[PDB]
Amino acid sequence: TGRPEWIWLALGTALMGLGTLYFLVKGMGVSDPDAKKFYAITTLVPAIAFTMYLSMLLGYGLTMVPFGGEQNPIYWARYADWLFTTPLLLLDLALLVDADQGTILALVGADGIMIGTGLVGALTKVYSYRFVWWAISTAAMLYILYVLFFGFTSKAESMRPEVASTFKVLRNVTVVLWSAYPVVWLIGSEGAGIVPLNIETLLFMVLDVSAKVGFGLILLRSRAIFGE
Amino acid sequence: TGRPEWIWLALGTALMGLGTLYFLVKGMGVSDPDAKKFYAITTLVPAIAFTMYLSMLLGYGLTMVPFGGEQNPIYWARYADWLFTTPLLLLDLALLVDADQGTILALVGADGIMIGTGLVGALTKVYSYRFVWWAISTAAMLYILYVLFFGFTSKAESMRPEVASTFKVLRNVTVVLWSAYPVVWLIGSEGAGIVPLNIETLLFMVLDVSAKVGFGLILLRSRAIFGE
Amino acid sequence: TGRPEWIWLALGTALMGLGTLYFLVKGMGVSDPDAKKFYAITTLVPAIAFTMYLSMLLGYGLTMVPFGGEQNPIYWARYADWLFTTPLLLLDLALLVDADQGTILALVGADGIMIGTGLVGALTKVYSYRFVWWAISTAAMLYILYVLFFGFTSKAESMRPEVASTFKVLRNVTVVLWSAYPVVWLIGSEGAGIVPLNIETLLFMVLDVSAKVGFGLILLRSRAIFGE
Numbered sequence A, B, C: 001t002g003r004p005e006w007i008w009l010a011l012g013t014a015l016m017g018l019g020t021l022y023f024l025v026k027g028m029g030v031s032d033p034d035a036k037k038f039y040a041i042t043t044l045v046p047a048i049a050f051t052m053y054l055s056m057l058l059g060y061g062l063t064m065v066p067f068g069g070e071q072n073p074i075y076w077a078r079y080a081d082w083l084f085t086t087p088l089l090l091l092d093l094a095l096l097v098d099a100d101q102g103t104i105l106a107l108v109g110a111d112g113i114m115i116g117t118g119l120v121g122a123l124t125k126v127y128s129y130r131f132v133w134w135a136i137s138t139a140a141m142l143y144i145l146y147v148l149f150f151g152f153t154s155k156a157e158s159m160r161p162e163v164a165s166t167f168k169v170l171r172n173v174t175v176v177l178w179s180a181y182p183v184v185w186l187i188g189s190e191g192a193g194i195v196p197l198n199i200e201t202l203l204f205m206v207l208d209v210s211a212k213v214g215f216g217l218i219l220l221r222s223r224a225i226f227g228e
C-alpha cells in the first residue's frame, strides 16, 4: 500500500517541480513565436506531473481495487497525469517535424485510447480482463510508435537538418522510454504482481522524470526550436 | 441488469472493431493531407466506441443508479464514448463544408452540453429530475441540428458540388439517427422504462453502428474528402 | 448542507440561463467570422454555468467530504463548470489581442492546473493538505494574471485602439473578479470555514454572474469584436 514507496513519490514530486521551475525560468529569455510554443508545451508537462506526483505522495491519487480476491492499492493519479502529458509530449514531436493536422489528431486520439484503456485495466475487478485492456492499450502504443517512424521521421528528413537530428534523438528517447511502461505495468501491482508496488513506483518515477524532464532538457537546449 | 443484453454488446464490440480495422487499412492507401484528416477523424470514432462497448460487455461500464425507489442498471460508458465521438463526427461534417472556427466551437460546445447533461440525467437519483436533464440535452441537440441546416448546408452549396452532395447525405443521416437517441433514452431504462434494457441496448447498438461505421463508409468512399 | 443556499443557486441558475439566451438571440444578428467566434465562446460560458448551477440546485453537484473530523458539504460541480468556462474566458481575451498559440496553450494549461488542483483541494480528507493545494492553485492563478499583464497588455497596445481599450477593461475585470475566488474558498466551507456555506454560495454566485454575464455584456457590446 501507500508507505514504502513514499520516498520515490517524494523524489518524483521534487524532480518534477524543479524541472518545471527550470523550464519556466529558462523560457523567460525567449520571445520567438515558435520557440514560445515549445517552452509552453514542455513546461506544462512536468508541471502537471508535479501535481499528480504530489497527489500520490499525499494519498489522494491512491485507491483500492478488488481483484485476484485481494484488495490491491492502485495509484490512479498516474493516468490523470498521462492523459494530458503524453499527448503534449507527442505535440512537441509533431510541432518539431511540422506534422499535418491529420497526423496530430491520429496521434492524440491513439494516445487517448492508450491511457484510457490503461486506466480501465488498472481499475478492472476481474483479473484476466485487466490484461485484455493492457493488450488494447499496448496496440495503441504500437500505433503511436509506428506513426513516429513511418509518418514522422520520413518528413523530418525533408526539413532542416537541425530539426531532423533533434527529432531523431527525441524520437529514439520516446520509443525506448514509452515501451518500458507496459512492461512495468505488466510485472507490477497493476498486472501479474511479480514486482512489488515499492519497486513499481521507483521504476515509473525514473521513467517519468526521464521522459519529461530529460526529454525537455534535450528539446529546450536545441536550436531546432527556433526558425533561424 | 447486465446479462440478456450481452449479445448486443458483443455484436456492437465486434462491429466497431471490424469497422475500425477496415478504416485503418483503407486509409493506408492515402497520402493527401485533407484526405488524411477525414481518415484520422473517422477511424478514431469506431475505435473509441469499440473500447466502450467492450467495457460494457465486460461489466466495467455498468453501474447501479437508485431512483423510482429501485436499483436501476445504467451503462455510463456510453456517455464516455459519445463525449468524444459525437464531436468528432461533427468535426467531419464541419471540415467537409470548411466551417469557420466560430461555428465549430459552437457545435462542439453544444455537443459537450448535450452529452454532459445526458450523463447527469442518467445518474440522477430523483426520477422527475432525470427528464429535466433530458429536456436540456434535447435542446442542445436541436441547436446542433439547427446549425447543420441553417449554418452549414447554406455554405456547402457555396462549395464544390461533390462536397455539397456528400455533406447533404451525411447531414441527413446524422439528423435522422441522432434524433432517435433521445427517444430511445426516454422510453428505455434511463427514462420511463417502457422498453427493457435488453431492447434499449439493441436499439443503441443499431444506431451507434449506423452513425459511426455506416456514416464513415459513406464519407470515406466519397471523392469529397480529396481536394482534387 | 444543501438547503439555506438554495436561493442563491436558483438565482444563479436563472441569471446564467437568461444570460445565455440573451447572448444567443443577440448573436443572431451577426455574420462576421471573427465576431462569430466571440459570440460562440461567450455564449457557451453561461450555458455551461447554467447546467452546473442547476446541478447544484437539484443536489446532484453536491457531495460530502470528511475532514476536520467532520462531514463537510462540498459542491464539486463548480469545478466541472470552471474547468471549461475559465479557459473559454481566457480564449476570449487571447483572441481579442490575437495572442500566439504558445501563449494560449500556456494560459489554458495553467488554468487547467488551477482548477484541477482546486478540485483536489476541495476533496482532500486531510485538513492541512487542503491548503497546500490551495497554494498551488493560487500560484497557477498568479501565473495567468502575470501573462495577462506582461504577455498580453503589451501586445494589445500594438493592435487597434478599440481592441486595446476593450481588452484593458476586460483584463481589469478579470483580474479583480478572479482574485476574489481564492479568498472566498479560503474563508468558506472548503477552507477554514469562517464563512458559512450559505454566504459562500452567495459570494460565488455574485462573482460567477459578473465574471460570465457581466464580462460577456462588455465584450459583446464592443466594436472590438469586429475587424472593421
Ligand SMILES: CC(C)CCC[C@H](C)CCC[C@H](C)CCC[C@@H](C)CCO[C@H](C)COCC[C@@H](C)CCC[C@@H](C)CCC[C@@H](C)CCCC(C)C
Binding pocket: A024, A025, A027, A028, A029, A030, A036, A037, A039, A040, A041, A043, A044, A047, A048, A050, A051, C102, C103, C104, C105, C106, C107, C109, C110, C113, C136, C137, C139, C140, C142, C143, C144, C146, C147, C150, C151
Ligand atoms: C513559479 C510558479 C509556481 C508561478 C509563476 C507565477 C509568478 C507570478 C511568476 C511569473 C513569471 C514566470 C515564471 C515567467 C515565465 C513565463 C513567461 C516567459 C510567459 C510570458 O508570456 C508568453 C509570451 C507566453 O508564452 C510562452 C510561455 C512559456 C515561456 C512558459 C510555459 C509555461 C506554461 C505551460 C504554463 C505553466 C503554468 C505554471 C507556471 C502554473 C503554476 C504551476 C502550478 C503547478 C501551480
Ligand SMILES: CC(C)CCC[C@H](C)CCC[C@H](C)CCC[C@@H](C)CCO[C@H](C)COCC[C@@H](C)CCC[C@@H](C)CCC[C@@H](C)CCCC(C)C
Binding pocket: A102, A103, A104, A105, A106, A107, A109, A110, A113, A136, A137, A139, A140, A142, A143, A144, A146, A147, A150, A151, B024, B025, B027, B028, B029, B030, B036, B037, B039, B040, B041, B043, B044, B047, B048, B050, B051
Ligand atoms: C491494428 C491496431 C489495433 C494497431 C495498429 C498498430 C500497428 C503497429 C500497425 C500500424 C499500421 C497501421 C494500421 C496503418 C494505418 C495508419 C497510417 C496510414 C498512418 C500514417 O501516418 C499518417 C500520415 C497519419 O495521418 C493519418 C491517419 C489515418 C490514415 C488513420 C486514422 C487512425 C487514427 C484516428 C488513430 C487510430 C488509433 C488506433 C489505430 C489505435 C489502436 C486501437 C486501439 C483501440 C487499441
Ligand SMILES: CC(C)CCC[C@H](C)CCC[C@H](C)CCC[C@@H](C)CCO[C@H](C)COCC[C@@H](C)CCC[C@@H](C)CCC[C@@H](C)CCCC(C)C
Binding pocket: B102, B103, B104, B105, B106, B107, B109, B110, B113, B136, B137, B139, B140, B142, B143, B144, B146, B147, B150, B151, C024, C025, C027, C028, C029, C030, C036, C037, C039, C040, C041, C043, C044, C047, C048, C050, C051
Ligand atoms: C434556446 C436553446 C436552449 C436551444 C436553441 C436551439 C433552437 C432550435 C433555436 C435555434 C436558433 C438559435 C438560438 C440561433 C443562435 C445561434 C446561431 C446564430 C448560430 C448560426 O450559425 C453560426 C454561423 C455559428 O457560429 C456562431 C455561433 C454563435 C452566434 C452562438 C454561440 C452559441 C454556442 C456557443 C452554442 C451554445 C449551445 C446552446 C445554444 C445549446 C443549448 C443550451 C443547452 C445548455 C441546453
Ligand SMILES: CC(C)CCC[C@H](C)CCC[C@H](C)CCC[C@H](C)CCOC[C@@H](C)OCC[C@@H](C)CCC[C@@H](C)CCC[C@@H](C)CCCC(C)C
Binding pocket: A010, A011, A013, A014, A015, A016, A017, A018, A020, A021, A046, A047, A050, A054, C129, C132, C135, C136, C139
Ligand atoms: C510546477 C511548480 C509548482 C513547481 C514548483 C514546485 C516547488 C515549489 C519547487 C520544487 C521543490 C520540490 C517540489 C521539493 C518538495 C518535495 C518534498 C521534499 C516531498 C516530501 O515531503 C514530505 C516528507 C518529508 O514527509 C513528511 C511527512 C508528511 C506527512 C508531511 C506533509 C508534507 C507535504 C504537505 C509537502 C508537500 C509540498 C511540496 C510538494 C511543495 C508545495 C508547492 C507550493 C507551490 C505550494
Ligand SMILES: CC(C)CCC[C@H](C)CCC[C@H](C)CCC[C@H](C)CCOC[C@@H](C)OCC[C@@H](C)CCC[C@@H](C)CCC[C@@H](C)CCCC(C)C
Binding pocket: A105, A108, A109, A110, A111, A112, A113, A114, A115, A116, A117, A120, A123, B044, B048, B051, B055, B060, B063, B076, B077, B079, B080, B081, B083, B084, B085, B088, B119, B123
Ligand atoms: C481527438 C479527440 C476526439 C480525443 C480522442 C479521444 C480520447 C482523447 C481518448 C479516447 C477515450 C478513452 C479511450 C475512453 C476511456 C474513458 C473511461 C472509460 C472513463 C472512466 O471512467 C471513470 C471510472 C473511474 O470509472 C469508474 C467506475 C465506477 C465505479 C464509478 C461510478 C461513477 C460513474 C457513473 C461516473 C463516470 C463519469 C464519466 C465516465 C463520464 C465521461 C468520462 C470522461 C473522462 C470521458
Ligand SMILES: CC(C)CCC[C@H](C)CCC[C@H](C)CCC[C@H](C)CCOC[C@@H](C)OCC[C@@H](C)CCC[C@@H](C)CCC[C@@H](C)CCCC(C)C
Binding pocket: A129, A132, A135, A136, A139, B010, B011, B013, B014, B015, B016, B017, B018, B020, B021, B046, B047, B050, B054
Ligand atoms: C480498434 C481496434 C482495437 C479494432 C480491432 C478489434 C479486434 C482485434 C478485431 C475485430 C473483432 C471483434 C472485436 C470481435 C470480438 C468480439 C467478441 C466476439 C465479443 C464476445 O465475446 C465474449 C463471449 C463469447 O462471451 C464469452 C464469455 C466471457 C465471460 C469471456 C470473456 C471474453 C472477452 C475477454 C473477449 C473480449 C476481447 C475482444 C473484444 C478483442 C480484444 C482486442 C485485442 C486488440 C486485445
Ligand SMILES: CC(C)CCC[C@H](C)CCC[C@H](C)CCC[C@H](C)CCOC[C@@H](C)OCC[C@@H](C)CCC[C@@H](C)CCC[C@@H](C)CCCC(C)C
Binding pocket: B105, B108, B109, B110, B111, B112, B113, B114, B115, B116, B117, B120, B123, C044, C048, C051, C055, C060, C063, C076, C077, C079, C080, C081, C083, C084, C085, C088, C119, C123
Ligand atoms: C468548447 C470547449 C470549451 C468545451 C465545451 C464544454 C464541454 C465540452 C461541455 C460542457 C460541460 C458539461 C455540460 C458538464 C457536465 C459534466 C458533469 C456534470 C460532471 C460529471 O461528474 C461526474 C459524476 C459521475 O458525478 C458523480 C457524482 C458523485 C456521486 C461522485 C463523487 C466524486 C466527485 C466529487 C468527483 C467529480 C470530479 C469531476 C466532476 C471534476 C470535473 C468533471 C469533468 C468531467 C469536467
Ligand SMILES: CC(C)CCC[C@H](C)CCC[C@H](C)CCC[C@H](C)CCOC[C@@H](C)OCC[C@@H](C)CCC[C@@H](C)CCC[C@@H](C)CCCC(C)C
Binding pocket: B129, B132, B135, B136, B139, C010, C011, C013, C014, C015, C016, C017, C018, C020, C021, C046, C047, C050, C054
Ligand atoms: C442555456 C439555456 C438552456 C438557457 C435557457 C434557460 C431557461 C430555459 C431560461 C432562463 C430562465 C431561468 C433558468 C429561470 C429558472 C430557474 C428557477 C427559478 C430555479 C428555481 O426553481 C426551483 C424552486 C422554486 O424550488 C422549488 C422546489 C423544487 C424541489 C422543484 C424543482 C424545480 C426544478 C426542476 C426547476 C429547474 C428547471 C429550470 C432550471 C429550467 C429548465 C430548462 C429547460 C430548457 C429544460
Ligand SMILES: CC(C)CCC[C@H](C)CCC[C@H](C)CCC[C@H](C)CCOC[C@@H](C)OCC[C@@H](C)CCC[C@@H](C)CCC[C@@H](C)CCCC(C)C
Binding pocket: A044, A048, A051, A055, A060, A063, A076, A077, A079, A080, A081, A083, A084, A085, A088, A119, A123, C105, C108, C109, C110, C111, C112, C113, C114, C115, C116, C117, C120, C123
Ligand atoms: C494544454 C493541455 C495539454 C491541457 C492542460 C492540462 C489540463 C487542462 C490541466 C492539468 C490537469 C490537472 C491539474 C489534473 C487534475 C485532475 C484530477 C487530479 C483528477 C480527479 O479525479 C477525480 C476525483 C474525483 O478523484 C476522486 C478520488 C476517488 C475517491 C474516486 C475513485 C475513482 C477513480 C479511481 C477514478 C478516477 C478517474 C480519473 C481520475 C481518470 C483521469 C481524470 C481526468 C479528469 C484527467
Ligand SMILES: CC(C)CCC[C@H](C)CCC[C@H](C)CCC[C@H](C)CCOC[C@H](C)OCC[C@@H](C)CCC[C@@H](C)CCC[C@@H](C)CCCC(C)C
Binding pocket: A014, A015, A016, A018, A019, A022, A173, A206, A209, A210, A211, A213, A214, A215, A217, A218, A221
Ligand atoms: C535525469 C534528467 C531527467 C534530468 C533531471 C533534472 C532535475 C529534475 C532537475 C532539473 C533542473 C536542474 C538544475 C538541471 C538543469 C541543468 C542542465 C541544463 C542539465 C543538463 O543536461 C543537459 C542534457 C543535454 O540533457 C540531457 C540529460 C539526459 C540524462 C537526459 C536523457 C533522458 C533519458 C533518455 C535517460 C535514460 C533514463 C535514465 C534515468 C537511466 C536509466 C538506466 C537503466 C539501465 C535502468
Ligand SMILES: CC(C)CCC[C@H](C)CCC[C@H](C)CCC[C@H](C)CCOC[C@H](C)OCC[C@@H](C)CCC[C@@H](C)CCC[C@@H](C)CCCC(C)C
Binding pocket: B014, B015, B016, B018, B019, B022, B173, B206, B209, B210, B211, B213, B214, B215, B217, B218, B221
Ligand atoms: C451497416 C453499416 C453500419 C456497415 C457495417 C459494417 C461492419 C461494422 C463491418 C465493417 C467492415 C466491412 C468489411 C464492410 C466494408 C465493405 C464495404 C466498402 C461496405 C459497403 O458499403 C458501402 C456504403 C456506400 O455504405 C453505406 C452503407 C449503409 C447501409 C450505411 C447507412 C447507415 C444508416 C443511415 C443505415 C440506417 C440504419 C439501419 C441499421 C436500418 C434500421 C432500420 C429501422 C427501420 C429500424
Ligand SMILES: CC(C)CCC[C@H](C)CCC[C@H](C)CCC[C@H](C)CCOC[C@H](C)OCC[C@@H](C)CCC[C@@H](C)CCC[C@@H](C)CCCC(C)C
Binding pocket: C014, C015, C016, C018, C019, C022, C173, C206, C209, C210, C211, C213, C214, C215, C217, C218, C221
Ligand atoms: C450584473 C451583470 C452580470 C448582468 C446580469 C444580467 C442578467 C444575468 C440577465 C441578462 C439579460 C438581460 C436582459 C440584460 C441585457 C441587457 C443589457 C444590454 C445590459 C446592459 O449592460 C451593459 C453593460 C455595458 O454591461 C456591463 C454591466 C456591468 C454591471 C458588468 C460588470 C461586471 C462586474 C465587473 C461587476 C462587479 C460585480 C458586482 C456584482 C458588484 C459587487 C459589489 C461588491 C462591493 C461586493
Ligand SMILES: *C/C=C(C)/C=C/C=C(C)/C=C/C1=C(C)CCCC1(C)C
Binding pocket: A049, A082, A085, A086, A089, A114, A115, A117, A118, A119, A133, A134, A135, A137, A138, A139, A141, A178, A179, A181, A182, A185, A208, A211, A212
Ligand atoms: C510522463 C509520462 C509518459 C511519457 C508516460 C507514458 C506512458 C505510456 C507509454 C503508457 C502505456 C501503457 C500501456 C502500453 C499498456 C498498459 C497501460 C499503460 C498505461 C501503462
Ligand SMILES: *C/C=C(C)/C=C/C=C(C)/C=C/C1=C(C)CCCC1(C)C
Binding pocket: B049, B082, B085, B086, B089, B114, B115, B117, B118, B119, B133, B134, B135, B137, B138, B139, B141, B178, B179, B181, B182, B185, B208, B211, B212
Ligand atoms: C456514436 C454515437 C452517436 C452519433 C451518438 C449520439 C447521441 C445523441 C444525439 C444523444 C442524445 C441525447 C439526448 C438528446 C437527450 C437524452 C440524453 C442523450 C445522451 C441520449
Ligand SMILES: *C/C=C(C)/C=C/C=C(C)/C=C/C1=C(C)CCCC1(C)C
Binding pocket: C049, C082, C085, C086, C089, C114, C115, C117, C118, C119, C133, C134, C135, C137, C138, C139, C141, C178, C179, C181, C182, C185, C208, C211, C212
Ligand atoms: C465563471 C467562473 C470564473 C471566472 C471562475 C474563476 C475561478 C478562479 C480564478 C478560481 C480559483 C481558485 C484558486 C486560485 C485557489 C483555490 C481553488 C479555486 C478553484 C477557488
